[PDB]
Amino acid sequence: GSHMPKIVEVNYTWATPLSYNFNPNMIVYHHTVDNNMTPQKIDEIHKQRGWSGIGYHFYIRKDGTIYRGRPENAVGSHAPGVNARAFGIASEGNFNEEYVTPQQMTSLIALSRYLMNKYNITDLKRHKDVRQTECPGNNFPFEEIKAKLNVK
Numbered sequence: 395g396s397h398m399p400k401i402v403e404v405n406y407t408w409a410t411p412l413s414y415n416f417n418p419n420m421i422v423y424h425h426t427v428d429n430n431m432t433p434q435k436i437d438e439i440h441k442q443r444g445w446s447g448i449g450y451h452f453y454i455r456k457d458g459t460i461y462r463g464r465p466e467n468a469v470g471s472h473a474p475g476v477n478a479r480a481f482g483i484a485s486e487g488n489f490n491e492e493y494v495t496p497q498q499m500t501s502l503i504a505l506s507r508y509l510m511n512k513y514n515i516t517d518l519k520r521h522k523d524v525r526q527t528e529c530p531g532n533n534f535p536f537e538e539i540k541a542k543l544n545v546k
């Protein structure tokens with residue numbers, strides 16, 4: 395059946411109760427702005443902001459490594475107003491000033507197709523499509539991702 399790319403599991407200690415009332419029908423793409431960040435650093439920041447921990451379901455570093463964030467069946471903390479219906483995929487970088495690496499692109503396509511097939515998702519969105527933000531940055535290759543995934 396449909397292939398799952400390599401997802402690195404990360405040991406988190408969740409501060410507040412996770413909700414599993416999560417029914418995804420959307421994928422939302424993010425950038426981190428700051429570089430150099432481990433998934434554990436993101437988790438620390440999101441906890442400061444009052445979230446249980448890392449708000450993204452997945453975090454893709456510059457070398458293409460895909461780290462798990464929130465459990466795949468839990469509500470995240472990445473796009474208030476669509477969190478109960480959206481996977482959140484963050485890429486390491488500030489794409490107002492950077493481009494995604496080739497390894498990030500490879501991982502973005504493989505991970506998106508995995509989620510789309512597993513959950514019957516066709517709706518791809520940038521953070522800035524659902525909320526007022528510059529995320530995921532001017533250079534984020536959204537139209538190219540949609541083209542490779544055959545989404546109109």
Ligand SMILES: [Zn+2]
Nearest residue numbers: 424425521529
């Ligand atoms: Zn964002």
